[PDB]
Amino acid sequence: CLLQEIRQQLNSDHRDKMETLEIDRGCLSLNLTSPNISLKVNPTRIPKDSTTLQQWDEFTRFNKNRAEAEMKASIELREAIALAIAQTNNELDAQRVATEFTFRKRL
Amino acid sequence: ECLFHREKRMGIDLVHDEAEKELLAEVDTILCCQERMRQHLDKANAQLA
Amino acid sequence: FGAKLPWRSDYVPLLSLPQRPRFTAQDFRQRG
Amino acid sequence: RSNVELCRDQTQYGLIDEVHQLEATINTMKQKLAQTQNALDALFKHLARIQADI
Amino acid sequence: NLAFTNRIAETVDAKNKIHTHLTKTLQEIFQIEMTIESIKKAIKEKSAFLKVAQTRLDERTRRPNVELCRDMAQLRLVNEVYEVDETIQTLQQRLRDSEDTLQSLAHTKATLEHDLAVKANTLYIDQEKCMSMRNSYPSTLRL
Amino acid sequence: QIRLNREHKESCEMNWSDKVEVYNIDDTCSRYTNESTQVQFYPHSSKFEESASTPETWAKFNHDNLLRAERERLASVNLRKLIDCILRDTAEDLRLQCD
Amino acid sequence: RYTPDDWYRSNLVSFQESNSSRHNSERLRVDTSRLIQDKYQQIRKTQAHSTQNLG
Amino acid sequence: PLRVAQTRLYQRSHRPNVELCRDNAQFRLLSEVEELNMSLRALKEKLQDA
Amino acid sequence: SDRSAQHELEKDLSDKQAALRIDDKCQHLRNTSEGVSYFRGVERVDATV
């Protein structure tokens, strides 16, 4: 469950940033002598939320750290699975052999 | 009834199997025991006479 | 051909295959 | 390959040599088949002999 | 009975493995449809851009006597026209490729499902028929 | 036209390969005899009894492929002659205009 | 009426065929995706070039 | 010779994409298989009687 | 002889109901499901006897 939700939220982040990249490459692309240039209403406005750089850096790195931690956990669970299967089969085999021996004694 | 009841399988799986070979052997063993025991019945009855 | 590819636009939705080259962090040796 | 670009290369000779070597290998494998079959037939012969003896 | 057991065992193994492969195959098909509509939208908008490019080319032959010129505008315009034509041809070839792959996967899915049904029938029949009478202690009839 | 010709060439080449292998297989088969080797117990099975085709259908397969190749060759010849005549007429008319 | 050998062969054939199909589809996906964006970007570039000249 | 006929058929079972053509030969071969089978059974019965 | 007869009738009913399920899944043909697809080429087969 945890892994699926982490992957989906990373997906959202990725699409957002690539959209931004589209906008910015267009911004570099245009220039003067261009049909779209004109005067726009009071664009000197500062945005409302106006995210700053520290939140950028945190939101980026924090979640990838979560991801690598989950990767460690996955490795741990897989090795534990191996060990558990091994132990179960160990007890089954040893117990059955001992019981067969006792049966022979009785006979 | 087991042996000829198997054949209801369809498609790609009416394979000649070690199961079926063993079962036919089973039938033969049943019959041989049947025969020998009836014969010994006959012999005992003659002894009674 | 074999020539310079930019290994950049690399989210195939589900490439759970012997593919997706360069970094994978898959496991190297497996069960047997 | 068009006009003058058709060229006689070391690749051509290598491929031809591959083909000929390949026919030779084909023939030798068939010979091995022959001898193995002979051996199998002989062994079955002796098996039948032994069962009759038993 | 010993052999009958391992017969059932291998049947079960087959069941499990085939079910897994079915799941992941249908997953892949579900993704390929998305790719298909992607390419179709691309075709639409490239056609629209051909539309506008021609449009801009057309009118300029109306200009009067001397100011009419064979401008580098005309050069680049004709280049764009032809280039987008070959682009369209390549994309349509890719499209044909896609539908061919789809028919192949269709055969795959059909065959897998039919085999599933057959083997389920086999295991079913074998179990409730044989294990019904063949139980423990070979004395009493199964009337 | 070149494209179409090459495609049909490839297809017919394929089927000819097939016929060659099958013919050689049966040739290798036919030299068997009762006393000889290559003589074994292999059990019955339905793969031995499988059916895939029938003589007339196989014949019509081959016949269709042959006729396809024939038509494409005819078309190629026609286009060739047309191209030649166009070349000739072009040259002559430009000559007269220059004169 | 059938043979265990041939049953085993039939199974293996089926599964390997499935794998072949899947690999084909994946490797098609990759390069199709690639071609999409490269064509888009080159078209954008040409359009901008044109408008600049005529301005 | 039942073996040699059987191997005939076994090789016949190896044919590619379009070669398996149900024909006279396969039919006749099946017929001969059945025939020699019944012959063998009859002969074994006569052996037991002797 | 009785047993032979019962076996034949059993075989017949088995294959018949198999076809029955196939054809009910068939008649469940109402539009808008996923299994419908393209595999064109089913208009030449000497299939059914």
UniProtKB/Swiss-Prot annotation, chain A:
It comes from the Eukaryota. Ubiquitinated, leading to its degradation. Deubiquitinated by USP16, promoting its stability. It is found in: Cytoplasm, Cytoskeleton, Cilium axoneme; Cytoplasm, Cytoskeleton, Flagellum axoneme; Cytoplasm, Cytoskeleton, Microtubule organizing center. Expressed in the testes (at protein level). Belongs to the tektin family. Microtubule inner protein (MIP) part of the dynein-decorated doublet microtubules (DMTs) in cilia and flagellar axoneme. Plays a key role in the assembly or attachment of the inner dynein arm to microtubules in sperm flagella and tracheal cilia. Forms filamentous polymers in the walls of ciliary and flagellar microtubules. Microtubule inner protein component of sperm flagellar doublet microtubules. May interact with CCDC172. This is Tektin-2. It comes from Mus musculus (Mouse). The gene is Tekt2.
Curated annotation (Swiss-Prot), chain B:
N- and O-glycosylated. Belongs to the tektin family. The lineage of its organism: Eukaryota, Metazoa, Chordata, Craniata, Vertebrata. Disruption phenotype: Sperm with reduced motility (47%) and forward progression and increased flagellar structural bending defects. However, normal fertility is maintained. Microtubule inner protein (MIP) part of the dynein-decorated doublet microtubules (DMTs) in cilia and flagellar axoneme. Forms filamentous polymers in the walls of ciliary and flagellar microtubules. Required for normal sperm mobility. This is Tektin-3. It is found in: Cytoplasm, Cytoskeleton, Cilium axoneme; Cytoplasm, Cytoskeleton, Flagellum axoneme; Cytoplasmic vesicle, Secretory vesicle, Acrosome outer membrane. Expressed preferentially in testis. Expressed predominantly in late pachytene spermatocytes and early round spermatids. Expressed in spermatozoa.
Curated annotation (Swiss-Prot), chain C:
It comes from the Eukaryota. It is found in: Cytoplasm, Cytoskeleton, Cilium axoneme; Cytoplasm, Cytoskeleton, Flagellum axoneme. Coiled coil: none annotated. Microtubule inner protein (MIP) part of the dynein-decorated doublet microtubules (DMTs) in cilia axoneme, which is required for motile cilia beating. Located at the center of the tektin bundle where may function to recruit tektins or stabilize the bundle. Microtubule inner protein component of sperm flagellar doublet microtubules. This is Tektin bundle-interacting protein 1. It comes from Mus musculus. The lineage of its organism: Eukaryota, Metazoa, Chordata, Craniata, Vertebrata. The gene is Tektip1.
Curated annotation (Swiss-Prot), chain F:
It is found in: Cytoplasm, Cytoskeleton, Cilium axoneme; Cytoplasm, Cytoskeleton, Flagellum axoneme. Detected in testis, where it is weakly expressed in round spermatids, and strongly expressed in the flagellum of step 16 elongated spermatids (at protein level). Expressed in spermatozoa. In the sperm flagellum, localizes to the principal piece and midpiece (at protein level). Specifically expressed in testis; not detected in other tissues tested. Ubiquitinated, leading to its degradation. Deubiquitinated by USP16, promoting its stability. It comes from the Eukaryota. Disruption phenotype: In a 129S5/SvEvBrd genetic background, males show progressive reduction in fertility with almost complete loss of fertility after 5 months of breeding. Testis weight and histology appear normal. Spermatozoa have significantly reduced forward motility. The sperm flagellum shows defective bending in the midpiece region which impairs waveform propagation and forward propulsion. Sperm ATP levels deplete significantly over time, probably as a result of excess energy consumption from inefficient flagellar beating. Microtubule inner protein component of sperm flagellar doublet microtubules. Belongs to the tektin family. This is Tektin-4. It comes from Mus musculus (Mouse). The gene is Tekt4.
